[PDB]
Amino acid sequence: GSEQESVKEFLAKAKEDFLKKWETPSQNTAQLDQFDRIKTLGTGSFGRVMLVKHKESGNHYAMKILDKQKVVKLKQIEHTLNEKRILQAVNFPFLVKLEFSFKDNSNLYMVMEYVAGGEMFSHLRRIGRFSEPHARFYAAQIVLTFEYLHSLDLIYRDLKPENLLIDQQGYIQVTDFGFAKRVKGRTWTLCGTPEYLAPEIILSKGYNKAVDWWALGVLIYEMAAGYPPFFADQPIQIYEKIVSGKVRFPSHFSSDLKDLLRNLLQVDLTKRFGNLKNGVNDIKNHKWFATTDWIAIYQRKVEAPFIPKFDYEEEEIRVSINEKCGKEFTEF
C-alpha cells in the first residue's frame, strides 16, 4: 500500500544487523556459576535441559546443556555449530532468543528464552482443529518470520507443528534451527518430516526457499482441518500423494482458505505463491489475510486466540578437569 516501502527498508537493516553478527559471532557471553540451577526440564539426546535463574537479573532461562564428547560421537559437530551461529545472528519476535552461549572442558551451553506454552502438535491434538481466524493468526506469524529469514538467505526447511511453541502471551516461537541453511541458490540435502516435504525435495532434484512456502501450506491446512493434506501410513505413499498434487478440502473450509492453499500447495515451482515476482506479497495481500494487521502481529498488539496455563529432586553437572574435544568446537 501507501508507505509500504518501509518494509523493504526494515528488511535491509535486519540484514546489516545479521551479517555483522554473522561475520563476527558472539562467544562466551556468560558462564555456569552465573546462574542458579532451578530444575531439570528434561534430558534430550546430546544432554539435558535445565530451568535456570540468572543470579543477577533474577531471570528465567532454558539452558540446553549438550555434552561435547557425546555430540561428536552422535556425529553432529557441524549441525550444532551451525545452529548456534544462526541463532546468535538472528533477531525476530517469533524466533526463540539465544540469550547466552558459553563452554568449558566437557560441554557446550545454550541459554534460551524460557517459554511455558508447549508445542503446536500438542495443542492441535487437544483442540482438534482451529478456527480459520485462529489458524490465520498463526499463519501470519509464520509468514512474517519466513519473510525475515528469507531476507537473510536462510532456508528453514523444517516447518512443522512440533517446531512451533506457544507464548505465555499466546504468540508463536519457532524453535530448533538444526536443518537451517544459509543459501543463495539451490541445495540438495534431504531432511525433515515427509508430510511437509515439497515435491522438489522428494524428487531428489534441486530445491530453494520455496520449500518453506510449500510447508506453510501443509501447515495452514493441518491447523484448520485438524489433519495434514497428505497423510498415509507408510512413507512411500505420502511421497506419491505429495507429488500427485491433488488436495481435497474438508467442506467447512472457506472459499478464501481454499484459494490461498491452492496457490501455496502448487507443485509448479513457477506458479507457487511466495516464489514469484510479487514475492511474499501475493501471500500477505491475499484475501484470506485481508483481515490481518501485519504490523500489529509483529508488535504483538493483536489478541491471542488463547493463552496456555502458566519434594525437590536433584542432578549432577560433570565439568571435567581437562578439555575434551576442544579443537572441534573452537567456533562455538
For the chain, the domain total comes to 2
Q: Are residues 11 and 72 in the same domain?
A: no
CA distance 287 to 300: 22
Q: Are residues 96 and 29 in the same domain?
A: yes
Q: Which of 67, 158, 167, 282 is catalytic?
A: 158
Is position 118 annotated in a ligand binding site?
yes
Q: Are residues 101 and 217 in the same domain?
A: no
Q: How many CB atoms lie within 10 A of CB 250?
A: 12
CB-based contacts of 285: which residues, under 8 Å, 6+ apart? 278
How many whole angstroms from its chain centre is CA 43?
21
Experimental determination technique? X-ray
Q: Are residues 152 and 193 in the same domain?
A: yes
Residue 158 catalytic? yes
Domain residues for 124?
A: 2-24+119-309
Is position 116 annotated in a ligand binding site?
yes
The phi, psi pair for 67, rounded to 5°, reads: -50, 120
Q: Are residues 92 and 187 in the same domain?
A: no
Return the CATH number at 103: 3.30.200.20
CA distance 8 to 62: 34
CB 213 within 8 A of CB 272: yes
Q: Are residues 276 and 178 in the same domain?
A: yes
CB-based contacts of 42: which residues, under 8 Å, 6+ apart? 48, 49
Q: Are residues 66 and 200 in the same domain?
A: no
Is position 326 annotated in a ligand binding site?
no
Q: Are residues 153 and 296 in the same domain?
A: yes
Is position 280 annotated in a ligand binding site?
no
Q: Are residues 221 and 293 in the same domain?
A: yes
Residue 76: exposure state from Cβ atoms within 10 A (0-12, 13-18, ≥19): middle
Return the CATH number at 186: 1.10.510.10
Q: Are residues 55 and 131 in the same domain?
A: no
Give which of 199, 219, 92 is closest to 147, Cα–Cα: 92
Is position 184 annotated in a ligand binding site?
no
Is position 179 annotated in a ligand binding site?
no
Beta-bridge partner residues of 59:
54
CB 209 within 8 A of CB 155: yes
Cell reading at 257: 482458505
Q: Are residues 257 and 139 in the same domain?
A: yes
Residue 124 one-letter amino acid? L
How many whole angstroms from its chain centre is CA 20?
22
As a whole number of Å, the CA-based R_g of the chain is 21
253-259 long-range contacts (CB < 8 A, ≥24 apart) are: 253/132, 253/224, 253/225, 254/132, 254/288, 256/286, 256/287, 256/288, 257/132, 257/220, 257/224, 257/288, 259/286, 259/287, 259/288
The reported resolution of this PDB entry, expressed in Å, is: 2.9
Is position 162 annotated in a ligand binding site?
yes
CA distance 252 to 254: 6
Q: Are residues 322 and 265 in the same domain?
A: no
Residue 254 one-letter amino acid? S
Is position 161 annotated in a ligand binding site?
yes
CA distance 162 to 175: 9
Give which of 103, 86, 92, 119 is closest to 308, Cα–Cα: 119
Residue 273 one-letter amino acid? F
